[PDB]
């Protein structure tokens, strides 16, 4: 008898595994706080979304379309579609890596096989409903057992872990990139559009269960970060271990669990990865359907939407795998998480605005403290994103670009795009678009 949840499954995508492995292998227990803040954020926002439904009976998508003009709503839909595609790129890459580990076929073979097997997975999901729940619970239990055993064998320094987890510090540009990647992979803005739908059907105990699921997911994520950080860094390593830790794709993870599985970790880890990727795709299909059916009301079959998303995701993932090997796929997973974090504000600002706005939410209002905390966190996230973007662009421009004829054009284009992004965020933030009500 286990009252499991699907939120932790969405928090254990291959994107989360890749971002956690990178954070642990590049900054030891330095970005643990991002996992603590992100989760604390990711839960809080979700709560608001759920509460919105209970107070309105309509998804965030319907309200966003109703209270905004045609062009703003179209741009929001484009942002949501980009968010779903960026989420679905890691699933394809995760499953391709699982196939590479298991059947010893190249990564592009994995991506092609995942495109072929999306239909079979959809059919299986249609056939069984509790079997999927048991599969996700068993996968979560396997990941928890494997990583907790690995952690116990490792025995890291508790003082250093606490100092890294409760003392935020983005010590370096690379740390900023990995912190943004972790925020993207944990916050996952598109899920808001999905989560509201989960309450369209019709809570201290429900909140307690959600908090338990989130605590399990956060414990697993912290365990992955700590295990990667301790094993990759340690004090003395074999040259092979250092070379594997340098890149550390999603297919070199088996090196992590070798202590607690004994050279048999390849099969178990590949199975865990494949199950996690497939389950994340299953969950995100509903989110894509809800986005499509809310932002424009254009009804689309779930299987058709899933096929379109998987093809659009395979295009770039397959191109990257062909041009670059597993390291390229890892870079693409991190980039997809970064894009998710970057475009989270567009799907988060309307939620907070509608929660505050008494007109749309009616007499019922969310707790002022939670709304203020969410607003402050969202503003901090936007500022960190903009600072990292300006940082990387400036460093590229100052000395990394040789030509000068196109330097002015590139600078103008980048400044125009950044100004448009900031102007859109400011329009959505310090401006009221309220021409409706409950």
């Amino acid at each position, epitope marked *: 008898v286990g009252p499991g949840a699907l939120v932790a499954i969405g928090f254990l995508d291959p994107s989360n595994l890749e971002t956690d492995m990178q954070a642990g292998a590049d*900054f030891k227990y330095e970005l643990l706080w991002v996992v603590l803040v992100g989760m604390i954020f990711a839960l809080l926002i979700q709560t608001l979304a759920a509460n919105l439904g209970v107070k309105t009976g309509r998804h965030l998508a319907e309200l966003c379309r109703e209270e905004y003009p045609r062009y703003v709503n179209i741009c929001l839909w484009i942002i949501a579609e980009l968010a779903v595609i960026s989420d679905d790129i890691p699933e394809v890459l995760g499953t391709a890596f699982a196939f590479n580990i298991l059947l010893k076929i190249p990564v592009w073979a994995g991506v092609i096989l995942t495109v072929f097997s999306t239909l079979l997975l959809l059919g299986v999901q249609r056939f069984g409903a509790r079997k999927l729940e048991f599969i996700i619970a068993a996968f979560m239990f396997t990941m928890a057992a494997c990583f907790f055993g690995e952690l116990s064998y490792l025995r890291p320094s508790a003082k250093e872990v606490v100092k890294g987890m409760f003392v935020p510090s983005l*010590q*370096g540009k*690379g740390a900023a990139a990995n912190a943004i990647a972790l925020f993207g992979a944990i916050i996952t803005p598109y899920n808001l559009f999905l989560h509201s739908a989960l309450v369209l059907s019709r809570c201290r105990y429900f909140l307690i269960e959600c908090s338990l699921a989130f605590i399990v997911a956060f414990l697993i994520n912290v365990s992955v970060v700590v295990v990667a950080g301790t094993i990759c860094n340690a004090d003395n390593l074999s040259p092979t271990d250092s*070379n594997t830790c*340098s890149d550390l794709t999603l297919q070199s993870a088996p090196m992590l669990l070798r202590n607690v599985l004994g050279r048999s970790s390849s099969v178990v880890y590949a199975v865990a990865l494949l199950a996690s990727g497939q389950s994340t795709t299953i969950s995100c299909t509903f989110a894509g359907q809800v986005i499509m059916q809310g932002f424009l009301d254009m009804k689309m079959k779930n299987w058709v939407r899933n096929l379109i998303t998987r093809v659009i995701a395979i295009a770039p993932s397959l191109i990257v795998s062909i041009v670059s090997g597993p390291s390229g796929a890892g870079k693409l997973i991190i980039f997809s998480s970064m894009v998710l974090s970057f475009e989270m504000p567009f799907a988060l600002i309307p939620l907070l605005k509608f929660c505050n706005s008494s007109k749309k939410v009616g007499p019922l209002k969310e707790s002022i403290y939670t709304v203020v905390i969410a607003w402050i966190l969202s503003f901090a996230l936007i500022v960190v994103n903009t600072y990292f973007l300006v940082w990387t662009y400036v460093d590229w421009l100052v*000395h*990394n670009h040789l030509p000068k004829y196109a330097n002015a054009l590139v600078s103008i284009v980048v400044f125009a795009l950044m100004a448009a992004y900031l102007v859109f965020v400011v329009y959505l933030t310090f401006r009221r678009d309220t021409v409706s009500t409950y």
Partner: nanobody
């Protein structure tokens, strides 16, 4: 041009206090980590120190800790290593190195340097 150029060290007697400066240009190194490595006449390269852009991240080598103070000037994009209480065991060629974080530089430095000999 893009390069890293260690400068200093020379030769000292003991408690050398030698203050080695690594200057990097052409790739904007002072955003991840800018650390050092050492290699004795016959041996493999070893970690000596590192520092991140934030300023407090210095991770040292258990062989030498509390004697080397590493500071980073971001604006000039330079990494300074102060060696105090020097000893014969530290005789070696020192290589500046730059990475993507103060721990990745611990293992695989993206960019290396020619290095300078420090003899006691």
């Amino acid at each position: 041009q893009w390069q890293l150029v260690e400068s200093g060290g020379g030769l000292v007697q003991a408690g050398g206090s030698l203050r080695l400066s690594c200057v990097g240009s052409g790739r904007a190194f002072s955003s991840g980590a800018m650390g050092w490595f050492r290699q004795t006449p016959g041996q493999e390269r070893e970690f000596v120190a590192a520092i991140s852009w934030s300023g407090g991240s210095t991770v040292y080598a258990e062989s030498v800790k509390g004697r080397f103070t590493i500071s980073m000037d971001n604006a000039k994009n330079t990494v300074y290593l102060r060696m105090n209480s020097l000893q014969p065991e530290d005789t070696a060629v020192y290589y500046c190195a730059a990475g993507t974080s103060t721990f990745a530089l611990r293992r695989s430095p993206e960019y290396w340097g020619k290095g300078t000999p420090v003899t006691v």
